[PDB]
Amino acid sequence: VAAKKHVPIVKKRTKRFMRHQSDRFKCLDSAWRKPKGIDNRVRRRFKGNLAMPSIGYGSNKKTKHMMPSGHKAFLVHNVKDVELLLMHNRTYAAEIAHNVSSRKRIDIITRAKQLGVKVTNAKAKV
Amino acid sequence: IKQLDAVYESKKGFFLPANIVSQADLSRLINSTEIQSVLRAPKGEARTKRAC
Amino acid sequence: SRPTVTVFGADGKPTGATEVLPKVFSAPIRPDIVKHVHTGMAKNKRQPYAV
Amino acid sequence: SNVSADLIWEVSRNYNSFLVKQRTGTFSRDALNLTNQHSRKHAGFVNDKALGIVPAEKGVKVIAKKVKAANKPASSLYTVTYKSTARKAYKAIASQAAKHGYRADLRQAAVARASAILRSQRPVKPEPPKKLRGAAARR
Amino acid sequence: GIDLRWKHVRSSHRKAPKSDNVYLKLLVKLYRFLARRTEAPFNKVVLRRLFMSRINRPPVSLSRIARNLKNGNEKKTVVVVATVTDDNRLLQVPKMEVAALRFTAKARARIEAAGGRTLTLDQLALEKPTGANTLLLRGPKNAREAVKHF
Amino acid sequence: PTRFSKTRKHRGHVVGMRHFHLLRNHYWRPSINIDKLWSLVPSDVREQYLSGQKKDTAPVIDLLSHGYAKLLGKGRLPEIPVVVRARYVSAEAERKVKEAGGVVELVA
RNA sequence: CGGGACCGAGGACCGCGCUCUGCAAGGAUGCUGGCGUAAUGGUCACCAGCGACCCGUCUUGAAACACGGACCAAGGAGUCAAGGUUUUGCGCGAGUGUUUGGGUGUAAAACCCGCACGCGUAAUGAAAGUGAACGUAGGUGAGAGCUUCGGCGCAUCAUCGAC
RNA sequence: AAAGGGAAGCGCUUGUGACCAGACUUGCGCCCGGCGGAUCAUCCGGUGUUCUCACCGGUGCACUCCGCCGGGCUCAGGCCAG
């Protein structure tokens, strides 16, 4: 069903924090690593350089872990898992785990329709 | 069941231990009349109104 | 007096007999001590390995 | 004595077999747990007096702990099946939750769970067909 | 920017025990409630000593308790947030009412044989919730081999 | 355990005489004070003596059977006559035993 | 008395008040329109304005010099043991330590057993040796807590005594 | 598919093109009319309980209860705006 009424969801930063020189070296993954060189410009925070993650970018406590519909994702593996969201259909949505078979997915989707629970990936394996 | 008492009475150097708490029911202890009769009146509620 | 416990027969029905509950069932329940002793005791059957 | 509901909560507040812990919240599989939330208020296996509601073939089925049979698990639950009007089910559940002082704080949660189960037992409506959108999906 | 020559200081005292004893957790909850809802400084001191560690809770002997029972303290309830130990150098134990965290078996037996009473801290909370007519005792803190070698 | 070490956290940031052929069995002589002397009596009989239910009997204590060789005089004794058998005794311990009404017997 | 910009945090009532049928008084509501889908939003590629030295190491005060780096995958560096020390948690407590060994076993597990022994319970002296109460285990000044409201006074500190 | 007048690569912010995740589809509560059934209220008996609250069996004879179907009404509902 529709989610419970909430404050507007604000992301302070949508862009990811890319690792320094990971755009120039393929052996460097783009996952963030804090530069530890004493002369590093990103670590010293010169302007025009990559930003570094800090707790000031944190999301609002009222809307943290909310998908844009306002629900919180709950990973489910079976019908007994999705029936745990009987009392939270306006707050939690169900997300079927990737290794669940198609027929069990049909069972979970049928139970979630009876319980009025949103399924995030209900069109999978059809 | 009959032999369990003899089993713990035959262990030399060991006795069944004394608990540091006599009554484990904290609700009974707190809401007993002996404690409640001497308490100060509450200075607030669970939720506080926003002043300004 | 000390509590009693029912004795059940081979059919699963009570036999009419009771036993006095042993005094160990009123011991303190200490999960931290249980965890410490279990951590120590679970390593005592280990076989050594080395290159 | 040496055992209380407070002590059972202190023992099993960090781990038990009913616990489902994830990033977005902690849930409980306990049958006597209304709202399926891990807390002392809702831990029915911990609390001395507790209620639980499950679906039946039609209607709800409510179990309640019996304080005098805590050491007898086969006869520790008082079970009533309500297969009748939803209003009568709510009245009876609220009566056994609040009238005699048997966890009056769980009255709203019990009525809510009964209402949720009875609404889930209704027939479902067919969903509208999906509308194709964009460039690749429509063509 | 603001010029702060002085520095705000985080607390240098315990707010919770490091022990995972569930009975100690229940006792801490009880005395938190008592120290919040009563004006007695006794409950605050007892809660803060329940927070403390074992080197900060030295044992108290029956000889020390009998020493402090003199001069009009014979009827006060002795409160020790520590282990009460026995002293076999003391041949005659007087009648006394002691509440403690734990007793050794010989000390408890000698108190009960002398005709006194042994209590836990929750029983102390039941009978003297404001700590009236109580004698609060501590053991020798500096009487330790490490403290001697300091 | 390895996982609790600080190394895991730091991952990414790195006179007188000489005695030839000394034998300690010559110099073995453990000592006990008189304020521990009544602890060698078994507890029930000790409590009977301290209460005063034995007004016609005096206890005899052998220190060598308990593993002590010398009686020292720290503390005080009750007014009960006690016979003490010891290899060595200090002057104050013997004085306090005599004041308590007993006798110190010398043994080998 | 106008003109403009940005913002609407909170979520039954409680309060301060006022111009007192009510209110601009402890935080935005009311009315209306178009659309209801890629329209808003997002990702990717590119152009545009502005911004922006190549990393690591070394050196000293710092730069510069110098050294390493053609690219990618996998491997790759404060570990273990013994002995101390401080702190935390636990058990017992003037005691404590079953596991050298013995008994037992569903058999390298678990359970049970005790003599000796180690440490502690007494120190000092090169040694021979001797070995800790004048006193409610002392006086004074503080000192949490308690108090019958006169005082009793934990830990600890300073000082004077006693052994 | 795109860019390129002696480096590219990167940050902030628009735009273009390509490709997408959501959200929405109506719910709740009333007033009528038409159906389909008596697990309406009370009382009686049994049973269980938290010992005053419930379930079961009889009793309702349709101005009472429970669903369904057509309308009408109010409210709450998505995005961008005045």
| Closest alpha carbon to E136 in E55, E80, E67, E52 | E80
Helix axes D5-12, E22-37, angle to 10 degrees: 120
- Report the gap between the CA of E29 and the closest CA in chain D (Å): 11
* Protein CA D132 to sugar C1' H22 (Å): 14
For E30-41, b/e burial (b = at least 16 CB within 10 A) is: bbebbbebbebe
Contact D23, A95 (CB under 8 A): no
- The whole-angstrom separation of Cα A83 and Cα A115 is 8
- The whole-angstrom separation of Cα B18 and Cα D121 is 54
Q: Which residue has the tokens 């994830």?
A: D22
Give the nearest partner residue to A84 out of D29, D119, D120, using CB atoms. D29
Return the bridge partners of C19, or none. Answer: C5
Nucleotide nearest to C47 (CA to C1'): G108
Those residues whose C-beta lies under 8 Å from the C-beta of residue F33, and which sit 6 or more positions away, are F71, F72, F73, F74, F75, F93
- What's at C33, amino acid-wise? I
Interface contact flag, D4 B19, Cβ < 8 Å: no
- The whole-angstrom separation of Cα F103 and Cα F94 is 8
- The whole-angstrom separation of Cα B11 and Cα B16 is 10
Question: ∠ at Cα A32 (A30, A38), nearest 5°?
Answer: 115
Give SS3 for E100. Answer: strand
Does A39 show up as a binding residue in the annotation? yes
| Closest alpha carbon to D44 in D120, D113, D99 | D113
How do strand E60-61 and strand E77-85 relate by DSSP bridges?
parallel
* Protein CA C51 to sugar C1' G74 (Å): 22
- The whole-angstrom separation of Cα D41 and Cα D33 is 9
How do strand D19-21 and strand D26-28 relate by DSSP bridges?
antiparallel
Q: What is the CA radius of gyration of chain D?
A: 20
| Closest alpha carbon to A116 in A97, A88, A96 | A88
**B2 vs C contacts (CB less than 8 Å):** 19
| Closest alpha carbon to A117 in A86, A78, A79 | A86
Taking C1' of H51 and every protein CA, the nearest residue is D100
Distances (CA, A) of D2 to B25, C24, C26, E25: 9, 11, 6, 14
- The whole-angstrom separation of Cα E140 and Cα C8 is 56
- Quote the strand ranges of E63-149, DSSP E: 77-85, 97-103, 117-119, 134-136
Phi, psi of E61 (to 5 degrees): -95, 165
- The whole-angstrom separation of Cα D94 and Cα D92 is 6
- Report the gap between the CA of D1 and the closest CA in chain A (Å): 35
Give SS3 for C25. Answer: helix
| Closest alpha carbon to A88 in A112, A60, A62 | A112
Nucleotide nearest to D59 (CA to C1'): H39
Alpha carbon B12 to its chain's center: 30
Phi, psi of F103 (to 5 degrees): -140, 145
Give the nearest partner residue to B21 out of E26, E105, E130, using CB atoms. E26
Interface contact flag, F50 E92, Cβ < 8 Å: yes
- Report the gap between the CA of E52 and the closest CA in chain B (Å): 16
Helix axes E22-37, E41-50, angle to 10 degrees: 160
* Protein CA C34 to sugar C1' G118 (Å): 29
What's the residue count for chain B?
A: 52
Token reading at A64 = 């943290």
* Protein CA C41 to sugar C1' G104 (Å): 19
Q: Give me the total of CB pairs closer than 8 Å, taking one residue from chain E and one from chain F.
A: 11
Contact A16, A52 (CB under 8 A): no
Give the nearest partner residue to C26 out of D1, D7, D11, using CB atoms. D1
- For residues E87, E93, E98 and E103, what is the CA-based torsion angle, rounded to 10 degrees? 40
- The whole-angstrom separation of Cα E63 and Cα E88 is 9
Question: ∠ at Cα A8 (A6, A13), nearest 5°?
Answer: 135
Query: E118-122 — which CB contacts under 8 Å span 24+ positions?
Result: E119/B22, E119/E77, E120/B19, E120/B20, E120/B21, E120/B22, E121/B20, E121/B21, E121/E27, E121/E31, E121/E46, E121/E50, E121/E81, E122/B21, E122/B22, E122/B23, E122/B29, E122/E26, E122/E27, E122/E30
Phi, psi of E86 (to 5 degrees): -90, 150
Q: Which nucleotides of G are covered by protein (CB under 7 A)?
A: 9-10, 14, 26-27, 37-38, 42-43, 51-58, 63, 71-73, 78-80, 85-95, 97, 108-114, 121-122, 126-128, 130-133, 136-137, 144-148, 151-157
Give SS3 for A108. Answer: helix
Nucleotide nearest to D98 (CA to C1'): H50
- The whole-angstrom separation of Cα D25 and Cα A74 is 8
Task: Provide the 8-state DSSP code for E107.
Answer: H
- The whole-angstrom separation of Cα A106 and Cα E123 is 59
Task: Concatenate the DSSP letters of all residues of chain B into one string.
Answer: -TTHHHHHHS-TT--PPPPS-S---HHHHHHSHHHHTTPPPPS--SS-----
Task: Concatenate the DSSP letters of all residues of A40-103 into one string.
Answer: -HHHHT-TTS-----GGGPPPTTTTTB-TTS-EEEEE-SHHHHGGGTT-TTTEEEEE-TT--HH
Give SS3 for F71. Answer: strand
Interface contact flag, D2 C31, Cβ < 8 Å: no
Test mutation, D54, D120, D132, chain A, max A CBs within 10 A:
D120
Pick left, alpha or beta for residue F26 (phi over 0 → left; psi -120 to 50 → alpha; otherwise beta). alpha
| Closest alpha carbon to A87 in A122, A120, A116 | A116
Q: Alpha-carbon torsion A61, A64, A69, A73, what sign?
A: negative
Interface contact flag, D120 A74, Cβ < 8 Å: no
Contact A37, A49 (CB under 8 A): no
**B25 vs D contacts (CB less than 8 Å):** 4-6
- The whole-angstrom separation of Cα E94 and Cα E112 is 10
How do strand F70-72 and strand D19-21 relate by DSSP bridges?
unpaired
Pick left, alpha or beta for residue C10 (phi over 0 → left; psi -120 to 50 → alpha; otherwise beta). alpha
Which residue of chain D has the CA closest to A93? Answer: D24
Give the nearest partner residue to D116 out of A65, A86, A123, using CB atoms. A86
- Other C-beta atoms within 10 Å of A87: how many? 20
Contact E36, E25 (CB under 8 A): no
Which residue of chain B has the CA closest to D7? Answer: B24
- What's at A58, amino acid-wise? G
Token reading at F68 = 């002590």
- The whole-angstrom separation of Cα D103 and Cα D87 is 20
Return the bridge partners of E60, or none. Answer: E84
For D56-82, b/e burial (b = at least 16 CB within 10 A) is: eeebbbbbbbeeeeeeeeeeebeeeeb
Which residue of chain D has the CA closest to B27? Answer: D6
Contact A1, A22 (CB under 8 A): no
Q: Quick one: three-class SS letters along D92-111?
A: HHHHHHHCCCCCHHHHHHHH
- Report the gap between the CA of C41 and the closest CA in chain D (Å): 21
Which residue of chain C has the CA closest to B6? Answer: C22
- Report the gap between the CA of C51 and the closest CA in chain B (Å): 43
Contact E32, E63 (CB under 8 A): no
What's the residue count for chain A?
A: 126
Distances (CA, A) of C49 to B40, C46, F3: 65, 9, 20
Q: What is the resolution of this structure in A?
A: 2.6
Token reading at C48 = 């050594």
Q: How many CA atoms lie within 13 Å of F88's alpha carbon, on the beta-carbon side?
A: 14
Segment (H or E) for A39: none
Task: Concatenate the DSSP letters of all residues of D29-74 into one string.
Answer: --TT-GGGB-STTT-TTTSSS-EEEEE-SSSEEEEEE-GGGTT-GG
Contact E68, E137 (CB under 8 A): yes
Test mutation, E24, E26, E28, chain D, max D CBs within 10 A:
E26
Contact F53, F94 (CB under 8 A): no
* Protein CA B52 to sugar C1' G23 (Å): 19
Query: D129-136 — which CB contacts under 8 Å span 24+ positions?
Result: D130/A123
| Closest alpha carbon to E101 in E18, E23, E35 | E23
Q: Is E44 in CB contact (< 8 Å) with chain D? A: no
Q: Which residue has the tokens 């209380």?
A: D4
Interface contact flag, C22 B8, Cβ < 8 Å: yes
Q: Is E91 in CB contact (< 8 Å) with chain D? A: no
Task: Concatenate the DSSP letters of all residues of F10-70 into one string.
Answer: TTTT------TT--HHHH---EEEGGGGGGGS-HHHHHHHHHT--SS---EEEHHHHT--E
How do strand F60-62 and strand F83-86 relate by DSSP bridges?
parallel
D window 2-31, beta carbon within 8 A of B: 2-7
Contact D53, D93 (CB under 8 A): yes
Contact A1, A86 (CB under 8 A): no
Those residues whose C-beta lies under 8 Å from the C-beta of residue A95, and which sit 6 or more positions away, are A73, A74, A75, A76, A119, A120, A121
- Report the gap between the CA of D40 and the closest CA in chain C (Å): 19
- For residues E129, E133, E139 and E140, what is the CA-based torsion angle, rounded to 10 degrees? 130
- The whole-angstrom separation of Cα B19 and Cα B22 is 7
Q: Is D17 in CB contact (< 8 Å) with chain A? A: no
Those residues whose C-beta lies under 8 Å from the C-beta of residue E49, and which sit 6 or more positions away, are E57, E81
Structure-determination approach: cryo-EM
Those residues whose C-beta lies under 8 Å from the C-beta of residue E33, and which sit 6 or more positions away, are B30
Give SS3 for C20. Answer: strand
**D117 vs A contacts (CB less than 8 Å):** 86
Test mutation, D3, D4, D6, chain E, max E CBs within 10 A:
D6
**A113 vs D contacts (CB less than 8 Å):** 124, 127
